[PDB]
Amino acid sequence: SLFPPGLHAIYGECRRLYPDQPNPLQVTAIVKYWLGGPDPLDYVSMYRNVGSPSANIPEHWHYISFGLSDLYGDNRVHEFTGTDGPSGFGFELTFRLKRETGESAPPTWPAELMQGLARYVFQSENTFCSGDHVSWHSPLDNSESRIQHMLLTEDPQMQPVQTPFGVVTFLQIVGVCTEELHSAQQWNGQGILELLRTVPIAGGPWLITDMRRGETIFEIDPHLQERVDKGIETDGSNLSGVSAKCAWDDLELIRTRQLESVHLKFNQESGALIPLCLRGRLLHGRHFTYKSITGDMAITFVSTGVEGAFATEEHPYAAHGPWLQILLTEEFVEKMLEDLEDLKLPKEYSWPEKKLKVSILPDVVFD
């Protein structure tokens, strides 16, 4: 087919929002993914959006991906299901980049950013949800920008589109500072997105990313730090897991292996989230899962009361294949927290009484 039905359906929504831009800049993957190319997004459209500057919606460039959803419906890349359910991964990515004075065209770098995010989705098959975060650890545009990480949210304008191949929603990338990423992790992504909406330079109502932003929302409004602190104290973290570098070693719907001792291994970044796991999750009666990006190992920490776990108070370390579940009691979680003040490799922590070891190791270990 010369015009792909999934593609045409999204274009209808684009036309609705941009009736005066029938011919926007669009980039494309020179060797398409379904022909062996490295980049999963077939196209990225790049629109001018005049916004509503008086309402703290600056003029900006609006990017929309094509490829995460099912464009073609002929099983060249995604599995066809029908009008019901998700089309491909069920969403496309968007991004809103503040226009800098002098710019006559959208910068093309956000297409490369989007390809990176999509490559991860296609390879890991971990999907993105509104409120999720993506740590990145470099200026998104390769400048010296403090904007070095991302939160994900519903696009504030693009409505879900019904296509012959399923429903497609639109998930907007929002650039954030390290401090803001951390706040979303320790509290909740939705809460931080809402704060960004209230600070024009940090996003405003449409969560436009300003790559020239030099200050965090907490530096702009110190009172916001108190709001977040109170939130972490009262609500804990809503983070149920991360895709990360991790492993474990041997030191109900299934029979599981009962482990006498366990050795948990993390890289620097995942290791730094251990206190969140313990204090922000387990002490709130919740669970937290580290899921390997490289392979199939996963470590799910559970607290007493968590339902549907195969780790129990009597047998607290239990595995089904590469999936480890570890039940920690409140008393022991509190002890671990004290011992992990520092949260330089390797770092080793050992609790012989509980037959538990934690190592923080270089990334290569997890290859």
Partner: peptide
């Protein structure tokens, strides 16, 4: 619950 996708560029 929300999810973190960590250092997915590497």
């Amino acid at each position: 619950g929300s999810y973190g996708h960590l250092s997915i560029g590497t």
